[PDB]
Amino acid sequence: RADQLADESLESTRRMLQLVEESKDAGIRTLVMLDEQGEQLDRVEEGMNHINQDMKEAEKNLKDLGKARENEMDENLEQVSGIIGNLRHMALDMGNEIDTQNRQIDRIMEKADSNKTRIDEANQRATKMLG
Amino acid sequence: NRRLQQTQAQVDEVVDIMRVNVDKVLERDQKLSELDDRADALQAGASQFETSAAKLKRKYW
Amino acid sequence: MAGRSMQAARCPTDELSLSNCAVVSEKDYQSGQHVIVRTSPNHKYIFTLRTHPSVVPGSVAFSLPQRKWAGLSIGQEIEVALYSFDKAKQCIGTMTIEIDFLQKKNIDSNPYDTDKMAAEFIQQFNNQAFSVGQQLVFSFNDKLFGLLVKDIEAMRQKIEVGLVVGNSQVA
Amino acid sequence: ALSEIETRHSEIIKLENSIRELHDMFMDMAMLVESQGEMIDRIEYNVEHAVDYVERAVSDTKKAVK
Amino acid sequence: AEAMALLAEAERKVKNSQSFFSGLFGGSSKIEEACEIYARAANMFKMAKNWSAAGNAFCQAAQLHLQLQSKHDAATCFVDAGNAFKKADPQEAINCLMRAIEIYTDMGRFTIAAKHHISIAEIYETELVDVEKAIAHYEQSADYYKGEESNSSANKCLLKVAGYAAQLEQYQKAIDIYEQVGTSAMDSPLLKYSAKDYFFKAALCHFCIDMLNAKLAVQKYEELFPAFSDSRECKLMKKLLEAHEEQNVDSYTESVKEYDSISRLDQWLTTMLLRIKKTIQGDEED
Amino acid sequence: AEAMALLAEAERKVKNSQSFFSGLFGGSSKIEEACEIYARAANMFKMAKNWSAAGNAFCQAAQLHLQLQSKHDAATCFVDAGNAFKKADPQEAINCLMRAIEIYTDMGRFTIAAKHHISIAEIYETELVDVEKAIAHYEQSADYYKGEESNSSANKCLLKVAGYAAQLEQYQKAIDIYEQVGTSAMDSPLLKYSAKDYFFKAALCHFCIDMLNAKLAVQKYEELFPAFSDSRECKLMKKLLEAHEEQNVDSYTESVKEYDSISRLDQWLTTMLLRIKKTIQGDEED
Amino acid sequence: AEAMALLAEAERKVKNSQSFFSGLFGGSSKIEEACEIYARAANMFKMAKNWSAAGNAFCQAAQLHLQLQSKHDAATCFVDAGNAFKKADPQEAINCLMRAIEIYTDMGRFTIAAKHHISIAEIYETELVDVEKAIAHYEQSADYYKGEESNSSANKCLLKVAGYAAQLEQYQKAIDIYEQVGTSAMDSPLLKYSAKDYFFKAALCHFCIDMLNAKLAVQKYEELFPAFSDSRECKLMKKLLEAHEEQNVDSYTESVKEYDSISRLDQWLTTMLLRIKKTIQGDEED
* F146 close to G (CB below 8 A): yes
Per-residue b/e over E223-246, b at no fewer than 16 CB within 10 Å? beeeebbbbbbbbbbbbbbebbee
Q: Which amino acid is at G209?
A: I
Contacts of F80-86 with C-beta under 8 Å, sequence gap 24+, read F80/F42, F81/F42, F81/F55, F81/F56, F82/F116, F84/F42, F84/F46, F84/F51, F84/F54, F84/F55, F84/F58, F85/F51, F85/F52, F85/F55, F86/F123
Q: How far apart are alpha carbons B11 and G229 in whole angstroms?
A: 12
Inter-chain contact E194–D42, Cβ cutoff 8 Å? Answer: no
Candidates E33, E225, E228: best to mutate against A (most CBs of A within 10 A) is E228
CB F62, CB F26: distance < 8 Å = no
Inter-chain contact F229–B13, Cβ cutoff 8 Å? Answer: yes
Count Cβ–Cβ pairs < 8 Å, chain B vs chain D. Answer: 93
Sequence-distant (6+) residues with CB within 8 A of E160 are E118, E121, E135, E138
Determination technique used: cryo-EM
Chain G residues in contact with F190 (beta carbon < 8 A)? none
C-alpha dihedral sign at E89, E90, E94, E100:
negative
Nearest to G169 by CA among G270, G267, G266, G271: G271
Q: How far apart are alpha carbons B28 and A98 in whole angstroms?
A: 8
CB F175, CB F217: distance < 8 Å = yes
* E46 close to G (CB below 8 A): yes
Instruction: Give the side-chain half-sphere CA count within 13 A for E17.
Output: 14
Inter-chain contact A18–E29, Cβ cutoff 8 Å? Answer: no
Contacts of E215-218 with C-beta under 8 Å, sequence gap 24+, read E215/E241, E215/E245, E217/E175
Question: In terms of CA atoms, which chain A residue is nearest residue G110?
Answer: A110
Inter-chain contact A81–F228, Cβ cutoff 8 Å? Answer: yes
Sequence-distant (6+) residues with CB within 8 A of G79 are G96, G97, G100, G116
Question: In terms of CA atoms, which chain A residue is nearest residue B8?
Answer: A77
Q: Which amino acid is at E75?
A: A
Closest Cβ–Cβ partner in A30, A54, A55 for D29: A30
CA E146 from chain center: how many Å? 15
Q: How far apart are alpha carbons B17 and E166 in whole angstroms?
A: 34
Per-residue b/e over B34-45, b at no fewer than 16 CB within 10 Å? bbbbbbbbbbbb
CB G152, CB B27: distance < 8 Å = yes
DSSP C114-169: SHHHHHHHHTTS-SEEEETT-EEEEESSS-EEEEEEEEEEE---B-SEEEEEEEEE
Chain E residues in contact with A12 (beta carbon < 8 A)? 262
For residue C132, what are the β-bridge partners? none
Instruction: Give the side-chain half-sphere CA count within 13 A for E244.
Output: 25
Inter-chain contact G109–A106, Cβ cutoff 8 Å? Answer: no
Q: What angle do CA F123, F129, F130 make, to 5 degrees?
A: 90
Chain B touches chain G, with at least 3 Cβ pairs below 8 Å, answer yes
Distance from the Cα of F176 to chain C's closest Cα (Å) equals 14
H-state helical runs in chain G: 3-13, 28-47, 52-66, 71-87, 93-107, 110-126, 131-147, 151-167, 172-183, 195-204, 214-220, 234-245, 252-262, 267-284
Burial of G240 (0-12, 13-18, 19+ CB in 10 A): buried
C22 by DSSP, 3-state: which?
A: strand
Sequence-distant (6+) residues with CB within 8 A of C95 are C130, C149, C151, C152, C153, C162, C164, C168, C169, C170, C171
Instruction: Give the side-chain half-sphere CA count within 13 A for E195.
Output: 17
B24: domain CATH number is 1.20.5.110
CB E53, CB E20: distance < 8 Å = no
Sequence-distant (6+) residues with CB within 8 A of C21 are C47, C48, C49, C50, C128
Q: How far apart are alpha carbons F209 and C74 in whole angstroms?
A: 8
Closest Cβ–Cβ partner in F110, F149, F187 for G86: F149
| CB atoms near residue G279 (< 10 Å) | 16
Q: How far apart are alpha carbons G74 and G54 in whole angstroms?
A: 16
Nearest to D29 by CA among F226, A90, G232, A30: A30
Q: How far apart are alpha carbons F28 and C138 in whole angstroms?
A: 86
Cα distances (angstroms) measured from residue E262 to each of A74, A96, G119, G189, G191: 21, 34, 42, 19, 20
Chain A residues in contact with E35 (beta carbon < 8 A)? none
Count Cβ–Cβ pairs < 8 Å, chain B vs chain E. Answer: 20
Domain count of the fold of chain B: 1
Q: What angle do CA E157, E161, E165 make, to 5 degrees?
A: 165
CB E273, CB E260: distance < 8 Å = no
Range of the domain at B7: 1-61
Looking at chain B, the number of H-run helices and the number of E-run strands are: 3, 0
Length of chain A: 131
Q: How far apart are alpha carbons E54 and E7 in whole angstroms?
A: 11
Query: In which element (H, E) is residue B58 found?
Result: helix B57-60
Sequence-distant (6+) residues with CB within 8 A of E223 are E230, E233, E234, E235
Inter-chain contact F226–G264, Cβ cutoff 8 Å? Answer: yes
For residue C78, what are the β-bridge partners? C6
Length of chain E: 286
CB C4, CB C44: distance < 8 Å = no
Neighbours of chain C (3+ CB pairs under 8 A): F
C60 by DSSP, 3-state: which?
A: strand
Distance from the Cα of A9 to chain F's closest Cα (Å) equals 21
Which regions of D2-66 does DSSP assign to beta strands (E)? Answer: none
Q: Which amino acid is at B34?
A: E
Q: How far apart are alpha carbons F226 and G263 in whole angstroms?
A: 9
Chain E residues in contact with B41 (beta carbon < 8 A)? 72-73, 76
CB B46, CB D54: distance < 8 Å = yes
Neighbours of chain A (3+ CB pairs under 8 A): B, D, E, F, G
Closest Cβ–Cβ partner in A15, A26, A120 for E231: A15
CA F76 from chain center: how many Å? 20
Distance from the Cα of D36 to chain A's closest Cα (Å) equals 10
Chain C residues in contact with F213 (beta carbon < 8 A)? 73
SS3 sequence of G109-178: CHHHHHHHHHHHHHHHHHCCCCHHHHHHHHHHHHHHHHHCCCHHHHHHHHHHHHHHHHHCCCCHHHHHHH
Inter-chain contact E264–G227, Cβ cutoff 8 Å? Answer: yes
| CB atoms near residue A100 (< 10 Å) | 20
For residue C81, what are the β-bridge partners? C36
Length of chain C: 171
Chain G residues in contact with D28 (beta carbon < 8 A)? 190
Chain A residues in contact with E229 (beta carbon < 8 A)? 18-19, 22
Q: How far apart are alpha carbons E100 and E71 in whole angstroms?
A: 9
Burial of G4 (0-12, 13-18, 19+ CB in 10 A): exposed
Nearest to E138 by CA among E166, E170, E163: E163
Nearest to F283 by CA among F227, F214, F209: F209
Q: What is the DSSP letter of E99?
A: H
H-state helical runs in chain E: 3-13, 28-47, 52-68, 71-86, 93-107, 110-126, 131-147, 151-167, 172-186, 195-204, 215-219, 234-244, 251-262, 267-284
For residue C162, what are the β-bridge partners? C130
Q: How far apart are alpha carbons C165 and C161 in whole angstroms?
A: 13
Sequence-distant (6+) residues with CB within 8 A of F196 are F221, F229, F230, F232, F233, F234
Q: How far apart are alpha carbons F248 and F242 in whole angstroms?
A: 9
- According to DSSP, the β-strands at C22-24 and C43-51 are parallel
Q: How far apart are alpha carbons A69 and A2 in whole angstroms?
A: 14
Chain G residues in contact with E267 (beta carbon < 8 A)? 189
Nearest to E180 by CA among E138, E151, E211: E151
Per-residue b/e over F98-125, b at no fewer than 16 CB within 10 Å? ebbbebbbebbbbbbbbbbbbbbbebbb
CA E157 from chain center: how many Å? 6
Cα distances (angstroms) measured from residue C93 to each of C38, C135, C152: 27, 19, 8
| CB atoms near residue E146 (< 10 Å) | 18
F92: left (phi over 0), alpha (psi -120 to 50) or beta: left
